Ligand binder design. Structure first.
Ligand SMILES: O=C(c1cc(O)cc(F)c1)c1cc(O)c(O)c([N+](=O)[O-])c1
Ligand SMILES: O=C(c1cc(O)cc(F)c1)c1cc(O)c(O)c([N+](=O)[O-])c1
Lengths: 116, 116, 116, 116
């Protein structure tokens, strides 16, 4: 698993379950092409988005659909989504964990990058 | 000032000065129209982006060039930029402050939405 | 104002108003001596805690009563309080702003340390 | 494992390894008694601090020695330590993950609380 995303709920102190997200890759013509998508599990984690062979050098965007998450809980949040944009595998393959901690009017995001 | 942006540096414990950003408004064809831009001041703040009459309801994106900020400090960053995508809502008067707290491999963002 | 505290509410997207806090200074016997206190204003800020001459180098603790804040909004919180423990340092002049961003099960805190 | 602590480094995008921390419990006379201590592993995690039988109702304090962590990396940080104070097991046994995301002048902390 070279790319894993973990989402936490700072209001309930729980994983953020069933959070949808889309991953895009910047194409040579500078547009965003669809790369992978999925939803977080009961642990707040989304695994298996890609493989080492498919996950080439590039600029990637993770768009986490935080608005739908909060709406289903009865909250009208500030953000449309949490957006994480980063260059990946510039110095060879790495393993990436992207984390997001969600509140209705705020979110934090961090990356843990490890060398296989 | 209906919309202000404040950027802070979590490594130096200081305003993040001379940080460039662009604000976009989502168009009917789901593309991002440039709307305003600028660079943070010595206080880390960017004022005067828009006016009350110009700032209508809609989806806005603030794209903060964090990568250039960290590269100018000689620190390798994770993100290409920090993105803040939100719906501006006109139920009551609203002044928006978008704040971002920057670290090389993480950022936090919050909205302080008040009434004069 | 050598020391100011600002508290924000990540659930409502607003200053955290009427938040009580106490500031302590570590004594020679490793106990916490009360030093100053107050409640945040309508802007979420607490000014006038100390003066330049009183605020000497040492270890300070800011104890923010986040639990009472959330209980007054009817929201069950995780933390008993938010603690910010830091060394005040006199190499150059220094103005300190302690900020805290509150969620029921999470908080962030940062220091913005500037020079007039 | 009813109590686990995870520490991340927001400057390097890595687990925070070999971070010491002490856990205290509030005694009936309102003083802090030592409860458990340890250091984070190569994954940034500290497991096995306590057991379900030992981890009774009470007010607990986790003091994470962030200052020693940053000093060893050549950074002079703002905080003496990160302090997490919370009531545990008030409604029966729970499993607690305490997380801390560290920067030199800022930290975030969150709790994930699950029912066994
Ligand atoms: O967003 C924040 C913020 C973000 C965090 O992750 C943690 C925290 F303690 C504050 C913020 C907002 C403001 O309006 C503001 O003035 C400041 N400040 O000056 O320090 C900060
Ligand atoms: O990024 C974080 C994170 C973000 C924050 O704003 C504050 C904080 F204390 C941790 C994180 C990453 C992980 O991999 C992870 O397991 C967890 N967790 O379990 O709680 C959290």
């Amino acid at each position: 698993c070279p790319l894993m995303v973990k989402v936490l709920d700072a209001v309930r102190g729980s994983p953020a379950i069933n959070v949808a997200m889309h991953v895009f890759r910047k194409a040579a013509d500078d547009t965003w092409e669809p790369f992978a998508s999925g939803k977080t599990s009961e642990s707040g984690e989304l695994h298996g988005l890609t493989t080492e062979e498919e996950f080439v050098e590039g600029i990637y965007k993770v768009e986490i659909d935080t608005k739908s998450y909060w709406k289903a809980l009865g909250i009208s949040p500030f953000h449309e989504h949490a957006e994480v944009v980063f260059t990946a595998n510039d110095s060879g393959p790495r393993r990436y964990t992207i984390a997001a901690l969600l509140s209705p009017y705020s979110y934090s995001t961090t990356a843990v990058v490890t060398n296989p």
